[PDB]
Amino acid sequence: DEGYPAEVIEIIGRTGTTGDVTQVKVRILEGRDKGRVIRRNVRGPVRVGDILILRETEREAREIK
Amino acid sequence: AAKDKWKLKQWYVIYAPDFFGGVEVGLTPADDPEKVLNRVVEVTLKDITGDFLKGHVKLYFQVYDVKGQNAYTKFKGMKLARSYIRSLVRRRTTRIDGIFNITTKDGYKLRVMAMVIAARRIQTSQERAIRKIMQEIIYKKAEELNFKDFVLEAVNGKIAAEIAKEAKKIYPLKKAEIRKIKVLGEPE
Amino acid sequence: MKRRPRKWKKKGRMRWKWIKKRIRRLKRQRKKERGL
Amino acid sequence: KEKWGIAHIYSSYNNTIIHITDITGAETISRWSGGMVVKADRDEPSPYAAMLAARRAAEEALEKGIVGVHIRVRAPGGSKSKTPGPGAQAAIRALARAGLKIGRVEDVTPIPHDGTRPKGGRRGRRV
RNA sequence: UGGAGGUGAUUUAAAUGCCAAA
RNA sequence: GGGACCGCCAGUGGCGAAGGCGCCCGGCUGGAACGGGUCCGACGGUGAGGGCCGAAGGCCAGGGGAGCGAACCGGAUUAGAUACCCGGGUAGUCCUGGCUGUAAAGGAUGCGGGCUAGGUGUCGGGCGAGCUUCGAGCUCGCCCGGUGCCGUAGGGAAGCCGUUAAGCCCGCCGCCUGGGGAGUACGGCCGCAAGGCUGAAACUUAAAGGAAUUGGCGGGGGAGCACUACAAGGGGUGGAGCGUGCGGU
Ligand SMILES: [Mg+2]
Ligand SMILES: [Mg+2]
Ligand SMILES: [Mg+2]
Ligand SMILES: [Mg+2]
Ligand SMILES: [Mg+2]
Ligand SMILES: [Mg+2]
Ligand SMILES: [Mg+2]
Ligand SMILES: [Mg+2]
Ligand SMILES: [Mg+2]
Ligand SMILES: [Mg+2]
Ligand SMILES: [Mg+2]
Ligand SMILES: [Mg+2]
């Protein structure tokens, strides 16, 4: 109901129709799957060390080249 | 009303056939015990006897009689896993298949499929020779042994070892297996 | 009919197959009127 | 002891069906398809719909005493496509996440040894 | 380095060329 | 219960005059290669007229009909959509006995013989040497016959071909003579029919045709770039009255 915080640890690359989306690797900080590393798609400027609030932690973005 | 109907079901225990040890293999639900007849359950040979090598051999047991809360089964057929045999067939090798209809000593009708993999591409006459050797060995074994002994030897790999030893004289072999068994009829 | 592989080239003409079909249609009509 | 069942997964390019039965396969425990969890026909084969259907089926199976399942996944096969759709893997992962144990996994797509003739004519779909 | 084959696929719709150059 | 079809192994691999031929066991049968101090003794090449074989489709009688699917019936797309896409569906596709004799039936290359550098794969037979789990096994070299690639002299407009010639030479048959009219008209033969083989003239026209070069273009591929491009944003114009320029009247 409040989401789970995750920390960005690596930047993969830009994607999307107009280069508006970045793909990152994050580590869950809290919850059932705390500690796991998964990849996600982010909209907006982002750098290593930022914290995202994921509403659920079972969807993983498809890998890009 | 749906959950009402589910409460009318009872659980029955399934046992392996007698000559495989007769151990428990699973549980199945049903409300009327007559509905459990002729159900088929598949188990791997690793579950019967513990060994991680024979994890790709699958056996089918069919229920024939129910007494109390127990179900007893018969042997029906045996197969190798698809992913296993799909990894044996390679380019620059030869695959020899042979399918035979046999009758055991005590009047059981069986159909048996055996497979052999050669180290390289070989000529067709050598394939015919190997297939003939397979046929001779299988016919002799069927004439000699009984149903249960034949099945046990087929699944343990004795027949395949004998076939490989006899067929080395035509061409060196990479593998030799009894690929599949299906029962067709039983004595009256 | 006789073969003219030059006719099959598509530059500046329609497809030979359908010209052949049209000619064969035309020859049926002449033959029917001849028998009367 | 241990009540184990079987999860039959049918995956195509248009839908996904998840069907949990008992060990012998003659009794149905639960059954859910992609069209029962989403509203848009375009979303039926999506991985997300597969996750939702798998979770519903797993809950229904768990409340009835099933502990683990062996998995059989198939594409349409036959004279149709031989490749499973995008919803198979998501469905497999979702069953484990819901609390079931996982046994052995295999695919049972029917394969012809030169069977019948497919649709489309000798030129196929021309789009 | 350079070539020859085979199996798969290949996300809506989108026709035309006037005045002129004379 | 039923009808059609034989996956992977499978290989510029094999066999056949060509069309064509792929599950396993048994019977009958055609051709070729290799080995040969065997037999006959020029018995050979090509071949006008003539004969036989010949994918798919079609037709005439009798069966069968799973899947697919001309015609046709519906749903969509569209300006229209007699189509492409979707749901159905008759003939046909399959078996037995005949007829038809057509394909980009293409190696777009008629067949027999002698000769003219090499290099390197692979299939069948034979010979020699070395290994060996003694296997109808493995590796290397040479000879003959098939089947691919690179290439010398030579050839060619070039693309390219090059002992599997499109090279130099000895034979025989078939065919062609600028583009259209036209594979049409008339006549004849064959066929149940659909159709097959043979085949002009009047007139019209300055090119039609081939191989390669430089550009431009593609609802072809790859790399790069731009606030007179987009994405994320800030402010507007298009509605009213007026200032000024333009078309028209
Ligand atoms: Mg010509
Ligand atoms: Mg639906
Ligand atoms: Mg249709
Ligand atoms: Mg279109
Ligand atoms: Mg002759
Ligand atoms: Mg052909
Ligand atoms: Mg050669
Ligand atoms: Mg050359
Ligand atoms: Mg005439
Ligand atoms: Mg602009
Ligand atoms: Mg913008
Ligand atoms: Mg304004």
> Residue B24, class by beta-carbon neighbours within 10 Å (0-12 exposed, 13-18 middle, 19+ buried)?
exposed
C 2-21: CB within 7 Å of strand F: 2-9, 11-12, 19
Q: How many angstroms separate the first and last alpha carbons of chain C?
A: 26
Domain of B185? 7-188
Using CA atoms, how far apart are residues D70 and B84, in angstroms rounded to an integer? 18
Distance from CA of A3 to the nearest CA of D (A): 18
The total number of residues written for chain D in this structure: 127
Please check whether residue D24 touches B, CB under 8 A: yes
Q: Are B100 and B91 in contact (CB under 8 A)?
A: no
Structure-determination approach:
cryo-EM
Residues 8 to 27 of B: which have CB under 8 A from any D CB? 9, 11, 14, 24, 26-27
Angle D47-63/D88-98 helices, nearest 10 degrees?
40
Which residue, D14, D32, D3, is CA-closest to D95? D32
Domain count, chain B: 1
Q: Are B9 and B69 in contact (CB under 8 A)?
A: no
* Partners of residue A58 in chain D, C-beta under 8 Å: 51, 93-94, 97
**What are the start-end ranges of the E strands in chain B?**
10-15, 24-30, 40-44, 57-67, 70-80, 94-103, 109-118, 173-185
Whether the beta carbon of B3 falls within 7 A of nucleic chain F: the reply is no
Using CA atoms, how far apart are residues B23 and D73, in angstroms rounded to an integer? 29
* Partners of residue D97 in chain A, C-beta under 8 Å: 58
- Residue B2 included in any domain: no
Whether the beta carbon of B87 falls within 7 A of nucleic chain F: the reply is no
* Partners of residue D104 in chain B, C-beta under 8 Å: 44
User: Domains of chain D, with CATH numbers?
Assistant: 2-119 (3.30.420.80)
- Residue B82 included in any domain: yes
Q: Are D18 and D49 in contact (CB under 8 A)?
A: no
Whether the beta carbon of D125 falls within 7 A of nucleic chain E: the reply is yes
Q: Are B94 and B127 in contact (CB under 8 A)?
A: yes
- DSSP-assigned states of every residue in D13-52: SS-EEEEEE-SSSSSEEEEEEGGGT-S-GGGTTSHHHHHH
Contacts 24+ apart (CB under 8 A), B17-20: B17/B61, B17/B72, B17/B73, B17/B74, B17/B75, B19/B148, B19/B151, B19/B152, B20/B48, B20/B59, B20/B75
Q: Are B122 and B94 in contact (CB under 8 A)?
A: yes
Helix runs in C1-36, H state only? 16-35
- Residue B1 included in any domain: no
Q: Are B177 and B80 in contact (CB under 8 A)?
A: yes
Residue A63's SS3 state is: coil
From residue B7, give the alpha-carbon distance in Å to each of B4, B166, D24, D30: 5, 59, 19, 15
Show the tokens assigned to D29.
């425990």
Please, do chains D and B touch (3+ CB pairs < 8 Å)?
yes
> Residue B49, class by beta-carbon neighbours within 10 Å (0-12 exposed, 13-18 middle, 19+ buried)?
exposed
Q: What angle do CA B41, B45, B46 make, to 5 degrees?
A: 115
> Which residues are CB-neighbours of D24 under 8 A, at least 6 positions away?
B14, B26, B28, B39, B40, B41
Please check whether residue D26 touches B, CB under 8 A: yes
* Partners of residue D24 in chain B, C-beta under 8 Å: 14, 26, 28, 39-41
> Which residues are CB-neighbours of B184 under 8 A, at least 6 positions away?
B101, B109, B110, B111
Helix runs in B7-56, H state only? 45-48
Using CA atoms, how far apart are residues A61 and B6, in angstroms rounded to an integer? 41
How many Cα neighbours within 13 Å face the side chain of D93?
A: 14
Which residue, A36, A28, A26, is CA-closest to A5? A28
Residue B82's SS3 state is: helix
Using CA atoms, how far apart are residues B113 and B133, in angstroms rounded to an integer? 14
Bridge partners of B58, per DSSP, are B44, B79
Q: Are B25 and B49 in contact (CB under 8 A)?
A: no
Which residue, B146, B156, B136, B126, is CA-closest to B186? B146
Helix runs in B73-123, H state only? 82-86
Strand order in the sheet with D28-33: D28-33, D16-21, D4-11, D68-74, D101-107
Asked whether the CA dihedral B30, B35, B40, B45 is positive or negative, the reply is positive
> Which residues are CB-neighbours of B22 under 8 A, at least 6 positions away?
B15, B16
Phi–psi pair at B37, nearest 5 degrees:
-65, 145
Please, do chains B and A touch (3+ CB pairs < 8 Å)?
no
Q: Are B147 and B106 in contact (CB under 8 A)?
A: yes
Asked whether the CA dihedral B5, B69, D28, D54 is positive or negative, the reply is positive
Whether the beta carbon of D127 falls within 7 A of nucleic chain E: the reply is yes
CB contact under 8 A, D23 and B41: yes
B163: amino acid identity, one letter: I
Please check whether residue B30 touches D, CB under 8 A: yes
Breaks (C-N over 2.5 A) in chain B follow: none
Using CA atoms, how far apart are residues B46 and B54, in angstroms rounded to an integer? 6
Using CA atoms, how far apart are residues A63 and B110, in angstroms rounded to an integer? 51
Distance from CA of D26 to the nearest CA of A (A): 33
